Amino acid sequence: KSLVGVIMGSTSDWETMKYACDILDELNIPYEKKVVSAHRTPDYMFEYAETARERGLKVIIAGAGGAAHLPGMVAAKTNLPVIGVPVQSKALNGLDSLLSIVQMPGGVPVATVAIGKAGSTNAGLLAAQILGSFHDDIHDALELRREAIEKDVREGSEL
Amino acid sequence: MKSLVGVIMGSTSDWETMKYACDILDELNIPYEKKVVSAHRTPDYMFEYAETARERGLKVIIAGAGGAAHLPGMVAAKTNLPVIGVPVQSKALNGLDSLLSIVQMPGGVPVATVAIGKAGSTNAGLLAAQILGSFHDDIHDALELRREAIEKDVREGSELV
Amino acid sequence: KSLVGVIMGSTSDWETMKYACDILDELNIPYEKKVVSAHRTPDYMFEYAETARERGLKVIIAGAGGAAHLPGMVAAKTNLPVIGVPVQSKALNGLDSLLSIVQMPGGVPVATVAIGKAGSTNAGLLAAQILGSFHDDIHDALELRREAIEKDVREG
Amino acid sequence: MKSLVGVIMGSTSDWETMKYACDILDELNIPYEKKVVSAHRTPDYMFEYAETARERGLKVIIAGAGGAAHLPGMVAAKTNLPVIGVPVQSKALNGLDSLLSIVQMPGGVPVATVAIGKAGSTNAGLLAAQILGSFHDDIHDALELRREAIEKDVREGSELV
Amino acid sequence: KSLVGVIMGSTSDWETMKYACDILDELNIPYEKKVVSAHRTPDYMFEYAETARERGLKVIIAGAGGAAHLPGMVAAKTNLPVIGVPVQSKALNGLDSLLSIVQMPGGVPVATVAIGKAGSTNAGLLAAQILGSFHDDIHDALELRREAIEKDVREGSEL
Amino acid sequence: KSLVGVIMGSTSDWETMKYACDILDELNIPYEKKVVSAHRTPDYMFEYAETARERGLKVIIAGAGGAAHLPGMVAAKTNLPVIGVPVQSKALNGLDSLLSIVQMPGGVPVATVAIGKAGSTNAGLLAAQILGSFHDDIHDALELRREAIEKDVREG
Amino acid sequence: KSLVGVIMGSTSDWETMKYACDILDELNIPYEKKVVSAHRTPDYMFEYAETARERGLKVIIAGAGGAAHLPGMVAAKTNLPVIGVPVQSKALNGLDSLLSIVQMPGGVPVATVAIGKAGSTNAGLLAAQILGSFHDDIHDALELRREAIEKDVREG
Amino acid sequence: KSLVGVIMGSTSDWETMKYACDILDELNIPYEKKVVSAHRTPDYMFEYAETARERGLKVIIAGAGGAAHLPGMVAAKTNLPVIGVPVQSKALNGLDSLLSIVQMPGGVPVATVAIGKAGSTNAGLLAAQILGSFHDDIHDALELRREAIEKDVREG
């Protein structure tokens, strides 16, 4: 039973969105991953968003670039938390993606993370933290993961 | 009269910007409808509006939005009428967010984007008229006459006194 | 027992952050609100973040502008979800605030919302949606609220 | 065949971008002409091209330019055909200069602006078709069919395997 | 006999362009000032540019904002030096004006000055410097003006 | 006797500034080219600017990137027209170069041209146009050059 | 004997630059304040920078806006640390000022602080910190000031 | 005994930060270099900043990119001067890094230098200049280095 849905408008977004999925796998959180396009499959996008809650999802992670409407339009159609990953665009380096996603109007939040792969990693982590607010074992796994990275960084600290 | 142009915007506060497009349509006697349709607050209604636009006899839609300005692009995803997007000047980023959100549409879903704010809104009305004028000679002729009068006005007021 | 902490670096951020608090009040979600500064009270900020989970908080909303470090540093110190509100800054209109908050490196997410008051409203709603993923009554409230706004916009 | 769309650009190096618009027109069987017309290097020729476009039977002009991208706007000042402006990605500023130079046209002279680069160029072709499709049903129907096929393609390739 | 033409697309540009004209007056350089619009009077603009040289002008100062095409299109139609003043626009504060003017392609220079009133002052000064490269008295007037400002600034220097 | 000085802060700017020099060569305008740095040779830069007029120069072309001060500081030290070429910088793609050059305060104009090689070409042409305002033969050359390019573009 | 020089190109920059001075006054660090313009008094600017060290200054704080060359050109002429305050410009809100100051090439550092009044305050504090690296009492005064602010923010 | 600490959040920043170190080596200023991450080792970062003064450091050079909090958070925890190097980030080319570092609020200065390698070089030179305010020999070494560069640029 998937707890997180990871969606993106194009197969070319996968290069970015795989990082989020890697985190969910590392933390043993069941998820689904789909191509859902705001612009090329708008009706399907509404159906996906609409039914997410009934289907058992708790969080949706959505990636898009350019005029990046997928996270916001999904967010308009569900009251699950929606995390938006700005995919790095070719001309404007994800500045268009970022502003298109983060600047949502009052009433329809999108939890926006960094442009590109760091954000995608962070979307996975943030989905986990959301689950971890009620699942202690996920919270504990997040703490352990962070503690291991801290130790790794600090003990390789000399240059 | 059957509307040829739909002028829509996500919020009543956008009207201060969008009224300029309507003024142009009025000046050129182009029948139109104006509605508040919000991508984010009335998403199902937005799809219904877009979906049915062609059946309803509309030829062009002008859509205004600011910030994460998704109204024009999502309407455009749902109709093959030409969709003209007016970036409303946002408070923090002065319509830069509005502009990039509207203009940077992916291959397959064009939005005809005009200038941020009131100049763009005027121009949305004129562009809707130009679209119509590609098959309505009288609208094309009116546009020419309008432009010619402005040219004369400017060139004959050309001394700075 | 507070479920949400709403924090900001300066009392001058309250004009922006009150909007998040108004949403929490509307939805009857218990919360606490504090001035916690990354730069002027850095130790206190660590202690706040560190103990949030023990204290029963589920989500933190943090507002900051300029070189806006509060949300990210709090997120570095807790695995509670942290929502960052970029406060509109004077010179650069919140662009500095936004980039300072959203561009967090892998490992330390901050859920970033829009620059200014719209973002603040949305931080309250997003905190609620986080709660609502497990509390059905909060979820149903969010759905009802949204449906009433849809009707109001469509009809009038 | 009588051209319905003129596709112009200031430099042969812009063709790498502009060819996408032409590809769309070809796919939809819309007759068109393509010319190098430079605002800055052939200014008189640009005016002549714009001026005569309507007489010559064109209904829409697609114009690409980068940097200080004046071609679309100056063509638009000289015709009341709809003019679609494609911002070509510039070397230093990645088409930000191109975009602002094109989209920020003053009241009176709209330019239908699309995305920077190749996505915009594709979209210029589609938008020219949508303009035509407002009075040519078959072009409108083709656009619908095209969009419907893409929708099916995307939704049925929707699992990431 | 005017030596400099000062042109702008709109009467609302005058608030900016008057600074250039004030300098020309201060330096006793004869000039003309006209509204010439790239977008609303395109043919007139070409005629103005075309005939400038025959008419005895040596430099044109052109102001425009937004999608600011007047300086560049004038420059495409004459080989007089053309100085472009980016007028501060409402939404983007003259960033559009600046890029529209300065980013000319190889073959058609526009001498671009600062956004707004400082640039307009500077357009007047730059037109004078261009004349001053061959008229010694104008060069000497520029030196004297600059020397007086230097003395003024330095001697009011304590705060 | 040089009529134009073409200067730049670093030898790495030559890749950009050679384009201006190519135009001057094409038009047979005598010029000198030098490395003159606002930041590494500030005194020399003042001396260069100061003496330009005595030395018979009529126009200076100056290229610089990043915090691009060369054109403005030279312009502060001469009433010759100074043309500033923003060199494309690594991180910010000449945006810093452009703003550093064009945004001169009242009193000290710099004639700014496009970022990079197009601007450099244009600095040469603009220097020539300045000369051509009084030398008819240079003006006529510029007209002929432009007419040949028009024909080439329109026909082929 | 002044330890810090606070300079700016225009009297209109004083509104911004006073904040730095207020900090120096608060900490009892002797300073001088002068209008020194890179573009309108270039020779004077070189003389000021050149003689700073001989005159007993340890740090220079320089404010400028737009094409903001003052800090960098002073820094090219002294090896005292130079702190640059980007003054908020009218059109571009200090983005020009910031890029013009901070993007200095290898060899000529400028210590750049925030756009506007916050930056100016911080230029004063940074000058003090530099002095405080060798003057214990200045360092201790900085710690006390920061501690008092911490307490004020955390408690009220 | 190290006089300067050079720190960065990630080993991948070393490519940039080495330039600062090379300058310190050239000038024979003892320094230490460490990975200290604001977001991945926040407690360690506080301990490093807190103890810097007791440990004998006079200046800290800190590099960070993206949401670049390291310099500012270290600066919140010490009254040593802290120099911030904006590391060039992938998407936004260090614009995020720059705004995240330079826009510090009143009370907590960071001395910000250019984006990337030029900035890093300059952080080393600026640290030296700070020391050179009280160490004549460092000051003199800075003058000699600058004079040699001047000669090299002017002559060849």
UniProtKB/TrEMBL annotation, chains C, F, G, H:
Top EC class for this record: isomerase
List this protein's GO terms for biological process: 'de novo' IMP biosynthetic process
Q: Which EC number applies? A: 5.4.99.18
Q: Which SUPFAM superfamilies match?
A: N5-CAIR mutase (phosphoribosylaminoimidazole carboxylase, PurE) (SSF52255)
List the molecular function annotations (GO) for this entry. Answer: 5-(carboxyamino)imidazole ribonucleotide mutase activity; lyase activity
Residue ranges annotated for the PurE domain, each copy included: 2-153
Presence of the UniProt keyword Isomerase in the record: yes
Q: Which domain of life is it from?
A: Bacteria
Q: Which InterPro entries match?
A: PurE_ClassI, PurE_dom, PurE_prokaryotes
Which UniProt keywords are given for this protein, alphabetically ordered?
Isomerase, Lyase, Purine biosynthesis
Instruction: Tell me which residues bind substrate.
Output: S10, D13, R40
Q: Which reaction does it catalyse?
A: 5-carboxyamino-1-(5-phospho-D-ribosyl)imidazole + H(+) = 5-amino-1-(5-phospho-D-ribosyl)imidazole-4-carboxylate
Pathway named in the protein's UniProt entry = Purine metabolism; IMP biosynthesis via de novo pathway; 5-amino-1-(5-phospho-D-ribosyl)imidazole-4-carboxylate from 5-amino-1-(5-phospho-D-ribosyl)imidazole (N5-CAIR route): step 2/2
Q: Which NCBIfam families match?
A: purE
Q: Which HAMAP family match?
A: PurE_classI
Described by its record, this protein's role is as follows: Catalyzes the conversion of N5-carboxyaminoimidazole ribonucleotide (N5-CAIR) to 4-carboxy-5-aminoimidazole ribonucleotide (CAIR).
Family statement: Belongs to the AIR carboxylase family. Class I subfamily.
Name listed for the protein in its UniProt record: N5-carboxyaminoimidazole ribonucleotide mutase
**What organism does this protein naturally occur in?**
Bacillus anthracis (anthrax bacterium)
